[PDB]
Amino acid sequence: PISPIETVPVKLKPGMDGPKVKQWPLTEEKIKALVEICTEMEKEGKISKIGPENPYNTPVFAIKKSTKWRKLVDFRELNKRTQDFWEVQLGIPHPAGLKKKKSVTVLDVGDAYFSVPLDEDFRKYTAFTIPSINNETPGIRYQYNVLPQGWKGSPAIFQSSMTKILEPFRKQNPDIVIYQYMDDLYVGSDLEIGQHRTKIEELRQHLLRWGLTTPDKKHQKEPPFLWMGYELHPDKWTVQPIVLPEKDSWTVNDIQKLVGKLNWASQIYPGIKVRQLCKLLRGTKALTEVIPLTEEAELELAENREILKEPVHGVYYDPSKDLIAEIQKQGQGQWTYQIYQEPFKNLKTGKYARMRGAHTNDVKQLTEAVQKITTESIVIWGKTPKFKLPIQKETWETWWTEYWQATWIPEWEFVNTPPLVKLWYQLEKEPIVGAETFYVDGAANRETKLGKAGYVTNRGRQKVVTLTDTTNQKTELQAIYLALQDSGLEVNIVTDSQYALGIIQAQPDQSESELVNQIIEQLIKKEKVYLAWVPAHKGIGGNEQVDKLVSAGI
């Protein structure tokens, strides 16, 4: 059928005419296939024959499936010239946000696009031509009366048509839940098996009234349904079956695929780990290069294969209950979480493993994970979960009220799931009496890649080192690193590098730079460290001295 729904008005782009691409000459068998296909389409009203006056054309082709031919229309020129449409690809539901149902039925619409009418005033622009044999005579000309396959507007127009058609039915059956995806409909209810079937029948009849055919009960697929990499029953969901290969040799291609599969499973299998596997891809080039698994990657894989050994499903959402989100630290930079309404029946799980910058601490990371989960929760359930975090109220509060960036997180409470996040050191707020004062500095040359780092002290001491393969910034961190190694358990340090100050001041506990990591070790060793800053070349006390020192020969 062709739906009697009103058409969507369509236009070409402001300063543009319809396409006029010349039809390529085709072999005889393909001309035959097309004549036969179009003859049928014509009889069903999908296309109409047109005259010579219509100046537009778009190339058509035919391709043997099997022993069946398919009609292909190359709509690039038309698509280039067609207006933009309201985006259809705006997001899909996550299964964990769905509500449990007694029954869910899938109905696919037959010849979906061809069952929806195209704007009358726009049909002319879709003209195509079946070429005569060796192009001796004029070709047979048709234009479309329905949404063509491969045309820009089809997806969006089909979906908006389906929505209008469903509208009265939804108004009449408010407790029936329908989800539209491409040419499928998922129809769920809490009715008993008999009345559910009846309701499906009414939907089909309503759909048919509007030109849309669907499979009858005999031909309807049985659960679980495969969709978007998930597998769905009325009462639980999981990801599609994943089989991890057993192989001696792993190419970059294999490892990339394995990591994607593991990342995908991690939305319902708790504890999935991919860090060690990912390190294998570092600076990785040829997809065919074999990468020897490291012992750690080999164990990680095994630990994963074990987690995947037996099926795990997520449960659906109950809107009358709170969401609970728990987070655990796994390794460094690695976080894991689970979301449930009754312990411990997970709606979904997840992992967070992102470094925002080169330098952070665990308190900042945990807060970032909370934010990520919070955004996700709004999307999926339209509300915020209550968190259980492996951090003490005081630890978190000391940190954020002191730090210069703002934050807020939803309601939460401490849960004793080691490892706990703590502050590994705290810089003093005031300078330290009876602690040696170290003035530090550093230099390097822009075309030398060489430089120096050193310190001068109020107790008369000094030192300068030579650095190879270093920047003006790296020397600044080296100097502070020097001051720390050579000082007692309490030290005051004066830098003129806002750069170095910025870093240390944020109280990092991990870093991409090994220099910084080394400094972090020192800071954790000290009993007290005060760090202060002064402007370079203001002729300040000990700063001038050390500047002098390290700048020699540079």
Partner 1 sequence: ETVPVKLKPGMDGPKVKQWPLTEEKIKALVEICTEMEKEGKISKIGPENPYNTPVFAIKKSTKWRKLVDFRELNKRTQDFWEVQLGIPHPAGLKKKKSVTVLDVGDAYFSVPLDEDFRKYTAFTIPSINNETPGIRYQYNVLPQGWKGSPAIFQSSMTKILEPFRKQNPDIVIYQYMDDLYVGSDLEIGQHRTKIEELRQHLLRWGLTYELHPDKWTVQPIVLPEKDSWTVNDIQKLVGKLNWASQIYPGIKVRQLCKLLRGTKALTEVIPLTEEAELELAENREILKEPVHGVYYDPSKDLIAEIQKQGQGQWTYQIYQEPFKNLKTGKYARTNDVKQLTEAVQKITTESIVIWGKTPKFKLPIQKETWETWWTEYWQATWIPEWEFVNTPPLVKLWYQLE
Ligand X SMILES: Cc1ccnc2c1NC(=O)c1cccnc1N2C1CC1
Ligand Y SMILES: O=C(O)c1nc(Cc2c(-c3ccccc3)[nH]c3ccccc23)nc(O)c1O
Taking CB under 6 A as the criterion, the residue among 362, 441, 509, 544 binding ligand Y is 441
Distance of CA 5 to the CA centre of its chain: 37
Query: Minimal CB distance to Mn ion: which residue?
Result: 547
Exposed / middle / buried, residue 138 (Cβ in 10 Å: 0-12, 13-18, 19+):
exposed
Residue 156 binds: one of partner 1, ligand X, Mn ion, none (C-beta under 5 to 8 A by kind): partner 1
184 is in an annotated binding site: yes
Exposed / middle / buried, residue 365 (Cβ in 10 Å: 0-12, 13-18, 19+):
buried
Pairing between β-strand 462-468 and β-strand 450-457 as defined by DSSP bridges: antiparallel
| Contact flag: residue 515 with Cl ion (CB under 5 A) | yes
Query: Nearer to ligand Y by C-beta: 160 or 472?
Result: 472
DSSP 3-state of 400: helix
248 is in an annotated binding site: no
| Contact flag: residue 537 with ligand Y (CB under 6 A) | yes
| Contact flag: residue 326 with Mn ion (CB under 5 A) | no
H/E stretch holding 158 reads helix 154-172
Q: How far is the CB of 355 from Cl ion (least distance, A)?
A: 15
Distance CA 520, CA 509 (A): 6
Per-residue H/E/C for 24-89: CCCCHHHHHHHHHHHHHHHHHCCEEECCCCCCCEECEEEEECCCCEEEEECCHHHHHHECCCCCCC
Stated length of the chain: 554
Query: Nearer to Cl ion by C-beta: 394 or 514?
Result: 514
| Contact flag: residue 544 with Mn ion (CB under 5 A) | no
| Contact flag: residue 231 with Mn ion (CB under 5 A) | no
Helix axis angle, 498-505 relative to 472-485, nearest 10°? 60
| Contact flag: residue 536 with ligand Y (CB under 6 A) | yes
Residue 193 binds: one of ligand X, ligand Y, partner 1, none (C-beta under 5 to 8 A by kind): none
Q: How big is the CA angle at 215 (ends 214 and 216), to the nearest 5 degrees?
A: 115
Residue 536 binds: one of Cl ion, ligand Y, ligand X, none (C-beta under 5 to 8 A by kind): ligand Y
Q: How far is the CB of 498 from Mn ion (least distance, A)?
A: 10
Residues in region 443-462 near Mn ion by CB under 5 A: none
121 is in an annotated binding site: no
Residues in region 463-482 near ligand Y by CB under 6 A: 476
Q: How far is the CB of 441 from ligand Y (least distance, A)?
A: 5
Distance CA 453, CA 550 (A): 6
Q: Which span (13-21, 336-344, 500-508, 539-547) binds Mn ion, by CB under 5 A?
A: 539-547
Residue 101 binds: one of partner 1, ligand X, Cl ion, none (C-beta under 5 to 8 A by kind): ligand X
Q: CA dihedral defined by 11, 16, 18, 21, rounded to 10 degrees?
A: -150
| Contact flag: residue 231 with ligand Y (CB under 6 A) | no
**Cβ pair 210, 196 in contact under 8 A:** no
74 is in an annotated binding site: no
Residue 186 binds: one of ligand X, Mn ion, partner 1, none (C-beta under 5 to 8 A by kind): ligand X
441 is in an annotated binding site: yes
Query: Nearer to ligand Y by C-beta: 110 or 535?
Result: 535
The Cβ of residue 324 has, within 10 Å, a number of other Cβ atoms equal to 18
Q: What are the residues whose beta carbons fall under 8 Å from the beta carbon of 40, sequence distance 6 or more?
A: none
Distance CA 317, CA 347 (A): 7
Distance CA 536, CA 271 (A): 50
Query: Nearer to ligand Y by C-beta: 96 or 444?
Result: 444
Q: How far is the CB of 270 from partner 1 (least distance, A)?
A: 22
Residue 515 binds: one of Mn ion, Cl ion, ligand Y, none (C-beta under 5 to 8 A by kind): Cl ion
Taking CB under 5 A as the criterion, the residue among 183, 231, 326, 441 binding Mn ion is 441
Query: Minimal CB distance to ligand X: which residue?
Result: 188
Residues that bind ligand X (CB under 6 A): 93, 98, 101, 104, 177-179, 186, 188, 225, 227, 232, 234
Query: Nearer to partner 1 by C-beta: 128 or 316?
Result: 316
Per-residue H/E/C for 268-323: CCCCCCCHHHHHHCCCCCCCCCECCCCHHHHHHHHHHHHHCCCCCCECCCCCCCCC
Q: Which span (7-15, 190-198, 266-274, 496-504) binds Mn ion, by CB under 5 A?
A: 496-504
Distance CA 465, CA 542 (A): 18
The site for Mn ion (CB under 5 A) is made up of 441, 496-497, 547
Q: Which residues are annotated as a binding site for Mg(2+)?
A: 108, 183-184, 441, 476, 496, 547
